[PDB]
Design a protein around this ligand. Structure first.
Ligand SMILES: OC[C@H]1O[C@H](O[C@H]2[C@H](O)[C@@H](O)[C@H](OCCCCCCC3CCCCC3)O[C@@H]2CO)[C@H](O)[C@@H](O)[C@@H]1O
Ligand SMILES: *C(=O)/C=C/N[C@@H](C(=O)O)C(C)(C)S(=O)O
Length: 265
């Protein structure tokens, strides 16, 4: 594979779309690679990690409990609810809802949690509270993935998302237990995690949340590193490409390969 920036450029050329990327040291925030890092991209399902950071903040404040059971109705369900559709009779705890939202990308679980933090506006206010003045959630799950050109709704920037994830995972804004919980939910991703491990060389750590949307939107927020350590945050977003899902996945994997082969920078 070529150097990271050369591979990122190659991916735009091959996809005819925009790629946004940040590679950042998790412990210090040192930015290593930045490409269109201040440009907007639809967050898609990656917003679910920030959502659960807001839930954990409420738990830390004593305004929520991960144990609290939420009972919901079938009419509350939206498209793609693999875990929540199985619990109409018994409900799910707030912690179970975050696990379903992050590890299975369950949309009804995400919406139930979104209401607890004040909806899209409440989550956006939380982002402003932690110093992210760019990321914004405007719609509920299912409609936030529309990815219309020029539409600023439900977007982030690679730089903003990377800084926000670092703040949630390591800045001590969340309690120690909450920081550990958010990380474990990403480690536990069932949608892409196992697949990524299957193609990663031995010794590489992965934790992640992926997303997909219209007009080719695709993305991933991840922790990656050799020696089985979450050394870096890597955020990659793609937008406005007509390519197949398989090729969008292949290009993101290609950028990851370039990082792996040329890690010491
Ligand atoms: O010299 C480095 C390595 O080069 C190859 O590894 C390949 C691997 O066989 C391939 O499967 C992967 O594809 C990349 C898979 C990446 C998948 C997800 C990437 C995500 C993760 C973080 C956020 C953004 C992208 O590339 C590496 C590096 O060339 C060799 O197979 C391996 O033995 C060797 O240790
Ligand atoms: C998160 O990225 C979700 C992606 N897609 C879903 C969505 O809510 O937009 C569907 C319903 C389109 S499907 O799961 O792809």
């Amino acid at each position: 594979s070529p150097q990271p920036l050369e591979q990122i450029k190659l991916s735009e050329s091959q996809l005819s779309g925009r790629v946004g990327m940040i590679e950042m040291d998790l412990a210090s925030g040192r930015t290593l690679t930045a490409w269109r890092a201040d440009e907007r991209f639809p967050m898609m399902s990656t917003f679910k990690v920030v959502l659960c950071g807001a839930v954990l903040a409420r738990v830390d404040a004593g305004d929520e409990q991960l144990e609290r059971k939420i009972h919901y109705r079938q009419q509350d369900l939206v498209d793609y609810s693999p875990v929540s559709e199985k619990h109409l009779a018994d409900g799910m705890t707030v912690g179970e809802l975050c696990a379903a939202a992050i590890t299975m990308s369950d949309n009804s679980a995400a919406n139930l949690l979104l209401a607890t933090v004040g909806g899209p506006a409440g989550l956006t206010a939380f982002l402003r509270q932690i110093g992210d003045n760019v990321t914004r959630l405007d719609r509920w799950a299912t409609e936030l993935n529309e990815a219309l050109p020029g539409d600023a709704r439900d977007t982030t920037t690679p730089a903003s998302m990377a800084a926000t994830l670092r703040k949630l995972l390591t800045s001590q804004r969340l309690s120690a237990r909450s920081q550990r919980q958010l990380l474990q939910w990403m480690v536990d991703d069932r949608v892409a995690g196992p697949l990524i491990r299957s193609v990663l060389p031995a010794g590489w750590f992965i934790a992640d949340k992926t997303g997909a949307g219209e007009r080719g939107a695709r993305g991933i927020v991840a922790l990656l590193g050799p020696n089985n350590k979450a050394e870096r945050i890597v955020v990659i977003y793609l937008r406005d490409t007509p390519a197949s899902m398989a090729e969008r996945n292949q290009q993101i994997a290609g950028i990851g390969a370039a990082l792996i082969e040329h890690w010491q920078r």
